[PDB]
Amino acid sequence: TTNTFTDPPVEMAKERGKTQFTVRDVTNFLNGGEEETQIVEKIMSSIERDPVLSVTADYDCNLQQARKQTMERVAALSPYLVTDTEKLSLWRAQLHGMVDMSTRTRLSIHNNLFIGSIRGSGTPEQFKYWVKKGAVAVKQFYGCFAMTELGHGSNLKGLETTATYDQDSDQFIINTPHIGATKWWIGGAAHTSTHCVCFAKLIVHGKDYGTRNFVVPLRNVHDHSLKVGVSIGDIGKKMGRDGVDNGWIQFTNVRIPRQNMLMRYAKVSDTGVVTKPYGALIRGRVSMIADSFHVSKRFLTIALRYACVRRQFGTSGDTKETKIIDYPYHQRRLLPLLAYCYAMKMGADEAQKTWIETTDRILALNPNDPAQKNDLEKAVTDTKELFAASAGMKAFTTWGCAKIIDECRQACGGHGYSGYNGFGQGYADWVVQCTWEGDNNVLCLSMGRGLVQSALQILAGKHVGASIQYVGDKSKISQNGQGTPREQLLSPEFLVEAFRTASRNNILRTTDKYQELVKTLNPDQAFEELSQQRFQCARIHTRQHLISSFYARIATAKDDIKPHLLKLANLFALWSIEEDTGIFLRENILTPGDIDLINSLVDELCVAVRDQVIGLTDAFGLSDFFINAPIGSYDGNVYEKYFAKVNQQNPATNPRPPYYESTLKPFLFREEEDDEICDLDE
Amino acid sequence: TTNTFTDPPVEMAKERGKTQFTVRDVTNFLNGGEEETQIVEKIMSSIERDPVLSVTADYDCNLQQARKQTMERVAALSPYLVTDTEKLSLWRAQLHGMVDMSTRTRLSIHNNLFIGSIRGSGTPEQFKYWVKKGAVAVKQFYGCFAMTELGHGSNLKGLETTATYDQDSDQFIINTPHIGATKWWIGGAAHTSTHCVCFAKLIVHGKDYGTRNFVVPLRNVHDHSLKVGVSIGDIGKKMGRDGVDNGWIQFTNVRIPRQNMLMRYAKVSDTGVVTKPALDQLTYGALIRGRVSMIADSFHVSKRFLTIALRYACVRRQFGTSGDTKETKIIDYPYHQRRLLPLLAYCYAMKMGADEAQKTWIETTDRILALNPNDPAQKNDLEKAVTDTKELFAASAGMKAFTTWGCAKIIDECRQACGGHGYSGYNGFGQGYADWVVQCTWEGDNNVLCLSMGRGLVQSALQILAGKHVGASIQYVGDKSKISQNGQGTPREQLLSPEFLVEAFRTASRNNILRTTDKYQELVKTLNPDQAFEELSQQRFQCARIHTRQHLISSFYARIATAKDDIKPHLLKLANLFALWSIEEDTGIFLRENILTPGDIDLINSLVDELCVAVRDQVIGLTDAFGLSDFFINAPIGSYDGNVYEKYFAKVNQQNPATNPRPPYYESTLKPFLFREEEDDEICDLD
């Protein structure tokens, strides 16, 4: 009646049959309402219809093909640069970034980083000028963002490129003093760009005034050749995003007008330097929280769809083997990952909201206009703390996405290794997402230190950010050895407390260690000695914030969905205990007996979520174009489509390799040279 | 005197002056003596110098270029198939796989999987016959291994391809009943193999006798065309190992003679009686070889990427202050040490594992191959050889899984440890990880391999409870722990003791196994064994994991006991670091079990910090101790002499000469775009 080949689409039909809610309600919940789900669906249709942007064949492209295709795609996407608002421009990017991270980046380098920066750091006259030149329209103008150097990436303050003021010419002289200063990883430079935003040390009359930005032209627009003193090359093969043309730039005494420097925050005239002694960087990290979500959901959808139809190994005496989604072991490997992926979106969303509700808080206040007082640096402090929290959020969610890609791949067995299922291509581009815009490990160490700082402010009884006030708290919870009951362990209120408690304890323990250390050591030294502890504190503090933010959203959810989201939220919170059993045991928040009960609670919550997976993955609202993997087809018709794919991209008419005559045949049919041995007397 | 560009080699020479020991003594310790090191060096210069095998341009290769050059490389390695011993063959494949996984696999499917199956499952005459037809020499013959189907990977008993016996003709009819039984991922099938070993359900008189082994010709050897009823295509793009031509195979009423079925253990007469049932799981005998060989790969590839990362750590500076305003060396920041150095210790430990497993595979298959199963006298000899292979199966499986996952993690942590320079193809991490990762899937999916070891460990516990004999490896499961904690803490002296750490680990493992064996007993009262183990799947994983980790820690100490004295203390530091760091991942497990107190965790963290600082002083020596030339590094930032930036800039420019500032799509794509005319929204006229 059905065989292995034909069973899958049928089985996928029973599972979509189990769904107890309206999918689109979960889609509106994720995306933040009916209005936005229709916003993202117009975006998605543009992308998927457009023939130029098609991704069917991207997996077989070699490096040359990818670059050219990315360029064509960028040309295709350019009309939306005039149309799109900041929200839409960014949204278009993130959604297109699920299947094509090369084009996203080749376009983002100009319209997000170059433009971002000359709007951000240029005076209104300047921005206006570059626009007249073609900047925004991208006519005869393509930009790029030259910050990083071969020798410096993380340390902006350490950059060695120089910009020296020459009054006799009224120009800047841009110079790379040696090859260590060579600009590096600059997207669009190798082959695309006609201008960059160079980041350079400001030098005037032999003084260093720190790092500034300059608009350096690289190419003569009309034949694309390099300007005098500009050297550029192609960085070449990368681990991923081979469609982006990252190059190196070296400047040998390049002369630009003084005016080319961007002077919103710092000015030069006639040797005079007037600094008049942020949002972009945070609206960039919050953008990546949402990135982790968009990409993750793709690979979970693939893996979980596959699990609903793949059968291997069953013991139940039934005629057909067990669907791997019905193995609790498999549910453990993926369903808490599905829960996590939900909470990234919440987390991303809440960080945008708290960000706007604080930059409004500062601006609605008169800093200059003291009500006889400026006493509200408290609004200012809350902002810095939010900026700390966004750092851990970027790090752990980009790591989490990375970890989800890898688990989902492994969960599809050998078929996870086929290029047509997307796991290979998708992991590499994403790993670049872990390094740029703040090295995840630097970020976490900074945040941890900031957290210690903040607790010393609490210990000194001063105001701190809303987001870390909780370290000043006393716990609702005390474990006397009398282990926690089920109705506690399934409580969001309880669960939120447990994590805040574990996070507070850690921080307070670190903080104590540090003060005690400081007795024999310097402040910078004492942090180095507590760097593991600092990293842990970033970890626990970000997770708890994520747990809370997920519950805080369920409460506002439509009732029909709510019981299901709660099941997802509980799985995420309890699972999180299991990954950190040692932590909760060290504070004696929980007991051994207790964790064997946690064990059973995730089991039990796995079976519940499991029941509704097709629904909770159809919720992401992805067409098969955005899946871009035959084993994750909405259809479930997995083996049929995968074979079709393999045959479409690789026509098998010929049984021999193109190297058959040159290589294979002459090796299989090789003669033997003689084993005869030279004559010798005696 | 120095700048960012010229500083690294000066720093590397300084770092390398700190070494307290003779590097080659550690290298000898890792290889099992100076003789072994000499043999290892002989293999490596052959690989280094042979211009067909050069990997300089490999990062830049498209799939069609990889495909072709892998074939050339396979050709150039083929003389060694006739002269190599088992040990040389293993080692030549392992060492070459450090930097070229595609050729390693493409050679391996014939010479490891295909050949191993005919030796291990064919009679001596059956083997001699294919030998004489070119099989071993690779003359007019290329083999492959057709086990996996689209439908089935892990469950070999559920394979759907059939081999149904036909007495009228004395043939097997090999048939793929639907697209789901299409053989899948078959290395060499797409383009190169002439013959396959194909696994199928042996059907005689309407009865399935289970999964059996047959040699099936795939192609006409003189023009390479497909034989009648044989259908093949190319699976195409993989995540890595693109030089390997993995194909799919469908059979439609393909006739082979009956003598093509491999009949060392299972037989079928010309009348159709399945003369014997196997009494063996030795249809998959060849798979054990390479699981064993995968423990070593994990060491060899780990040691390559830890050397890249850690040499780079010693020269890269970000954020520091110093007498001349030089920034700090990333290796001097304590977090970076804890990211890498415990992984360095892991890696050293992997080699201890790889060697045990290797010594047993080579020993065990001498015994197996020298036994005749058609001798009644020899029935008690083979009776032990079977249980030897069973134990070996189980031990290899968990060690394969965890060591290949640990390598995956090392490659990945080393990549990030190099920052953005880890993402450059030329520094090797990308091709490396993508090529490495299939090892966690093939020749046994790791998770499923963990489930198999978990089961074997429960069954070993029952033997123990029955007082019956068990391998030295698992004996400790029997004993009572020598440690008890009344909650007053564990001192520093015990926490730096090999005996204590070992015992701590054995205690954590034994208790999980003994508990899991407890639940199983309760379950077998209603359930069958099978259904019980599936209920215990999560438990089986846990046990595999701890016992494996306990095995490696124990094996590392057992070798440190035998070392030259001058190196022993540095090797000791790595061991305890590995051990204590391992407590640090599994902190839950040791507090769950009342082995450590909460107040011991603080202390463990500090000790890790100390051990790191001590191991950091000698990183160049230990990494040097691997014995890798720059060819096997294959990464500018991992250069021996540390001139990271010069070599990195040179590699990039050499592979991408920059004399043209336009792209190949300038005239067709970029210029037309950038110089596109204005869109006229001049509106139509209307009244």
Ligand SMILES: Cc1cc2nc3c(=O)[nH]c(=O)nc-3n(C[C@H](O)[C@H](O)[C@H](O)COP(=O)(O)OP(=O)(O)OC[C@H]3O[C@@H](n4cnc5c(N)ncnc54)[C@H](O)[C@@H]3O)c2cc1C
């Ligand atoms: C694909 C790609 C595209 C890029 N595109 C651009 C671009 O368009 N424009 C641009 O300007 N840049 C670009 N970059 C550069 C990118 O921003 C850098 O890779 C990153 O910002 C910093 O990396 P790094 O190489 O400086 O690493 P480093 O900062 O040197 O870090 C090296 C390692 O040491 C560790 N480390 C560093 N400091 C510390 C510390 N204080 N304590 C402990 N550990 C530490 C880090 O964790 C890291 O693992 C790109 C990079 C990539 C990979």
Ligand SMILES: Cc1cc2nc3c(=O)[nH]c(=O)nc-3n(C[C@H](O)[C@H](O)[C@H](O)COP(=O)(O)OP(=O)(O)OC[C@H]3O[C@@H](n4cnc5c(N)ncnc54)[C@H](O)[C@@H]3O)c2cc1C
């Ligand atoms: C590059 C490459 C080359 C290959 N070359 C060859 C070759 O030359 N010859 C050959 O014969 N084969 C080859 N294979 C096949 C390879 O051995 C299979 O991928 C491997 O055996 C895994 O099988 P599978 O994909 O069927 O996984 P499945 O068994 O289908 O498993 C899918 C997922 O379900 C999980 N799962 C399965 N069963 C259970 C259970 N009982 N409980 C809980 N979870 C479970 C697994 O962990 C896995 O994550 C190759 C594969 C690759 C990727």
